[PDB]
Design a protein around this nucleic acid. Structure first.
Ligand SMILES: [Mn+2]
Ligand SMILES: [Mn+2]
Ligand SMILES: [Mn+2]
Length: 425
DNA sequence: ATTATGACGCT
């Protein structure tokens, strides 16, 4: 009872830009705004592959990882913006720079963990305490939460429901108790409204957000009310929310482990996990995953918000699928040089902006007909930011997968160069 | 033949 800690010590938010690459292109080209549109990579094979879809286009069924020519069959008015091509490959620079604009704004409010190009986690605990002291017992007005949903409410027109749920929540609030977790989540959500208003003011970009007590719940909440909304998931709402949440919807259970939870335990929903003891879960899924599942199904997770705004590795990848696979020495050399040239550019920019050098070069390849996504991965030193040297070293490090007697066999379906092991410069 | 990245666990 009194000693069963409930993991309500922290206020954590997950901010995620709505259809991020599409918004970046829509800011740049007003003719795309408020339209069914999508962002693609390449154009020759089937119109190119869609990696980002506006909500207007999604309403027609257009999804990521879909071919543009197929999307056009669902949505013939679909507008398409194309990723930049440099040295014969996709160049995502525009989106990395847009991402940095957003991250730098978020960083003004609290310490952030960059979780992907378009999303970050925020530890708001200190911010909420400061703000709660600032109110001096003053109650929280619905006006301060104009885009916030309270998950699970109302109980007992879309905006009409949102406001009812918010009203129920605020009326039930204990504003004098500066230690109530629900009050803390609420103040956290006020701050997140402010953060999202500043992001939209200063970039033009809209985003959604989740506010809860840990990373997994913040992330799951962010997705409940997209786009351009934020959702507060309280500790108390977890039992009902999880009672019908498919296990695969939880961060990190979307794959094989989640499938084995479902198969081994004979269950479907997150809530069913509560009926197992911790030892039972550790037995089936190992001691780490077991402890983590035993606390997660009760709404409790301790993974911290890491103070890390910048990527820990800088990478350059190109697939050579089908008949385009690289089959000669000259080919592998030229593409290693193109990849190494983009890598050099990004690394030099990184060293000047962020005062750090990478010290290790990771070369990964896929060979044709190999089942694995990484047929091989080998590392070597990264000592100077010179593309010719980096490409030569990647060759040097991979050339003994060539089984020819100036040819390359098995032909290469993927090259990948990754700079890692950063040290302050 | 969606591609292009990137974090992190396991051993
Ligand atoms: Mn997003
Ligand atoms: Mn997405
Ligand atoms: Mn995202």
């Amino acid at each position: 009872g009194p000693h069963m800690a409930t993991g309500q010590d922290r206020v954590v938010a997950l901010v995620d830009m709505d259809c991020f690459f599409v918004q970046v292109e829509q800011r740049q080209n007003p003719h795309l705004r408020n339209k069914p549109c999508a962002v693609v990579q390449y154009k020759s094979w089937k119109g190119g592959g869609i990696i980002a879809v506006s909500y207007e286009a999604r309403a027609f069924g257009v999804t990521r990882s879909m071919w543009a020519d197929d999307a056009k069959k669902l949505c013939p008015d679909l507008l398409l913006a194309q990723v930049r091509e440099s040295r014969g490959k996709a160049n995502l620079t525009k989106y990395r720079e847009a991402s940095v604009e957003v991250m730098e704004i978020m960083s003004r409010f609290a310490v952030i963990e960059r979780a992907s190009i378009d999303e970050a986690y925020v530890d708001l605990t200190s911010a909420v305490q400061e703000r709660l002291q600032k109110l001096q017992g003053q109650p929280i007005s619905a006006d301060l939460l104009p885009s916030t949903y309270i998950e699970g409410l109302p109980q007992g027109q879309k905006e009409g429901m949102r406001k009812q749920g918010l009203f129920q929540w605020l009326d039930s609030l204990q504003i004098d108790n500066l230690t109530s977790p629900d009050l803390q989540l609420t103040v956290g959500a006020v701050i997140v409204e402010e953060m999202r208003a500043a992001i939209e003011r200063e970039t033009g970009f809209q985003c959604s957000a989740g506010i809860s007590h840990n990373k997994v719940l913040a992330k799951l909440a962010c997705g409940l009310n997209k786009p351009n909304r934020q959702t507060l998931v309280s500790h108390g709402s977890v039992p009902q929310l999880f009672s019908q949440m498919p296990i695969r919807k939880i961060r990190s259970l979307g794959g094989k482990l989640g499938a084995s939870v479902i198969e081994i335990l004979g269950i479907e929903y997150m809530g069913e996990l509560t009926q197992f003891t911790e030892s039972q879960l550790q037995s089936h899924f190992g001691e780490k995953n077991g402890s983590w599942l035993y606390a997660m199904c009760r709404g409790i997770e301790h993974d911290p918000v890491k103070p890390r705004q910048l990527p820990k590795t800088i990478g350059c990848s190109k697939n050579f699928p089908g008949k385009t696979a690289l089959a000669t020495r000259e080919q592998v050399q030229w593409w290693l040089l193109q990849l190494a040239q983009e890598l050099e550019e990004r690394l030099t920019k990184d060293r000047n902006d962020n005062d750090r050098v990478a010290t290790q070069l990771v070369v990964s390849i896929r060979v044709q007909g190999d089942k694995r996504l990484s047929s091989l991965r080998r590392c070597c030193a990264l000592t100077r930011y010179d593309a010719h040297k980096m490409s030569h070293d990647a060759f040097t490090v991979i050339k003994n997968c060539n089984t020819s007697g100036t040819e390359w066999s098995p032909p290469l379906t993927m090259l990948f160069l990754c700079a890692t092991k950063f040290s302050a410069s």
